[PDB]
Scaffold this active site. Sequence first.
Site, mmCIF file in Angstrom:
data_model
loop_
_atom_site.group_PDB
_atom_site.id
_atom_site.type_symbol
_atom_site.label_atom_id
_atom_site.label_comp_id
_atom_site.label_asym_id
_atom_site.label_seq_id
_atom_site.Cartn_x
_atom_site.Cartn_y
_atom_site.Cartn_z
ATOM 1 N N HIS A 159 1.022 -1.419 0.357
ATOM 2 C CA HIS A 159 0.385 0.041 0.260
ATOM 3 C C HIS A 159 0.933 1.460 0.320
ATOM 4 O O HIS A 159 0.703 2.419 -0.592
ATOM 5 C CB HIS A 159 -1.073 0.007 1.229
ATOM 6 C CG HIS A 159 -0.889 0.668 2.834
ATOM 7 N ND1 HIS A 159 -0.228 -0.885 3.600
ATOM 8 C CD2 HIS A 159 -0.353 1.497 2.266
ATOM 9 C CE1 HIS A 159 0.614 -0.227 4.660
ATOM 10 N NE2 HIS A 159 0.785 1.066 4.086
ATOM 11 N N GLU B 233 20.118 6.202 7.642
ATOM 12 C CA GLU B 233 19.048 7.326 7.881
ATOM 13 C C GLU B 233 18.405 7.331 10.301
ATOM 14 O O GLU B 233 18.530 5.761 10.575
ATOM 15 C CB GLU B 233 18.070 7.920 7.614
ATOM 16 C CG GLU B 233 16.874 8.839 7.160
ATOM 17 C CD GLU B 233 17.846 10.074 7.685
ATOM 18 O OE1 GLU B 233 18.672 10.072 8.491
ATOM 19 O OE2 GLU B 233 17.425 11.230 7.092
ATOM 20 N N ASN C 12 17.779 11.002 11.680
ATOM 21 C CA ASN C 12 16.637 12.244 11.848
ATOM 22 C C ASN C 12 16.731 12.482 10.798
ATOM 23 O O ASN C 12 17.391 12.723 9.884
ATOM 24 C CB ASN C 12 17.805 12.931 12.838
ATOM 25 C CG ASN C 12 16.932 14.192 12.889
ATOM 26 O OD1 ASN C 12 15.994 14.802 12.147
ATOM 27 N ND2 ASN C 12 17.428 14.802 14.267
ATOM 28 N N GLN D 200 17.931 16.708 9.870
ATOM 29 C CA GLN D 200 18.849 16.990 9.859
ATOM 30 C C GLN D 200 20.118 15.889 9.596
ATOM 31 O O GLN D 200 20.066 14.724 9.250
ATOM 32 C CB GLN D 200 19.489 16.749 11.675
ATOM 33 N N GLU E 12 23.668 8.584 5.366
ATOM 34 C CA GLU E 12 22.807 8.626 4.687
ATOM 35 C C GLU E 12 23.074 8.608 3.413
ATOM 36 O O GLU E 12 24.510 8.987 3.190
ATOM 37 C CB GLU E 12 21.828 10.029 4.696
ATOM 38 C CG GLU E 12 21.169 10.457 6.341
ATOM 39 C CD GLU E 12 21.738 11.335 6.780
ATOM 40 O OE1 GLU E 12 20.870 12.270 7.724
ATOM 41 O OE2 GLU E 12 23.001 11.729 6.216
ATOM 42 N N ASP F 295 -0.231 -7.509 1.415
ATOM 43 C CA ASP F 295 0.320 -6.480 1.530
ATOM 44 C C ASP F 295 1.985 -5.869 2.193
ATOM 45 O O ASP F 295 2.824 -5.612 2.399
ATOM 46 C CB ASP F 295 0.225 -5.332 3.234
ATOM 47 C CG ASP F 295 0.052 -4.232 2.814
ATOM 48 O OD1 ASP F 295 0.624 -3.345 1.486
ATOM 49 O OD2 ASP F 295 -0.146 -3.342 3.509
ATOM 50 N N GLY G 165 3.278 6.666 8.543
ATOM 51 C CA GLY G 165 4.211 6.568 8.272
ATOM 52 C C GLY G 165 4.963 5.259 8.732
ATOM 53 O O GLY G 165 6.342 5.648 8.528
ATOM 54 N N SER H 42 3.819 2.545 8.472
ATOM 55 C CA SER H 42 3.782 1.222 7.185
ATOM 56 C C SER H 42 4.771 1.094 6.407
ATOM 57 O O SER H 42 5.906 1.760 5.952
ATOM 58 C CB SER H 42 2.848 1.827 6.159
ATOM 59 O OG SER H 42 1.107 2.603 6.803
ATOM 60 N N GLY H 43 5.142 -0.341 6.013
ATOM 61 C CA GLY H 43 5.958 -1.498 5.136
ATOM 62 C C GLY H 43 7.060 -1.265 6.061
ATOM 63 O O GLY H 43 7.704 -1.646 5.639
HETATM 64 CA CA LIG Z 1 19.144 12.622 8.432
#
Ligand SMILES: [Ca+2]
Length: 240
Positions: free
Chosen positions: A45, A59, A61, A64, A69, A93, A186, A188-189
Amino acid sequence: VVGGTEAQRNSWPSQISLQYRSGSSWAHTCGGTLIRQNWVMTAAHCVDRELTFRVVVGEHNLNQNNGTEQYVGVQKIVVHPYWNTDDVAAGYDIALLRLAQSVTLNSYVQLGVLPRAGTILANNSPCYITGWGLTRTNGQLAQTLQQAYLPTVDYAICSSSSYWGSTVKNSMVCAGGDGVRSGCQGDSGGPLHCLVNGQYAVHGVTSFVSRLGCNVTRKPTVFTRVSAYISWINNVIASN
Ligand SMILES: [Ca+2]
């Protein structure tokens, strides 16, 4: 994650942020689990909309620079062919994203350990949900990655009338439901990490919560059961 605590930077290195292009910038929309250097497991979804997606690994934050990353485009999206956007309760799903480039592994970027096929957890098994999802029902995304302790609720209890009834299938894992801690929009997944024989493994892909709210008593967060999809996952990776 409602009722979470901030994760240590290196606790959950397979957690990724799935983001979409929004004007001159990017917005977090979903979590996922890095399962190969060039593949991410997420919720079907999360990729229903015809958006431009990228994955961010390492990741912590969202607001910031962490100095860790890596950003990579999504090259191919393979949704489970039985997925129906009209019916999340039917299951299926799950989706796999082939990344345009292979990411580099380190303390902040690792492959998620997946359970053996068919594995079911005993009721009340220890797990953490992780994600940058809302920190309150109808709230806002977290800035820093959050974790919450959400013990499983087995199928027999989860599909009982006062919990989720027929809405929950055996292809799902339920966890939490204490009315305090939960996934929320948020998340989700993303992964549900459960401790089994000394090792955390990703047993769930976060799928849904109650329409009534995120942290609702006897409405545990519901996840796609990863161990139901091992063959599907292997088949996709082998054919792509
Ligand atoms: Ca960051």
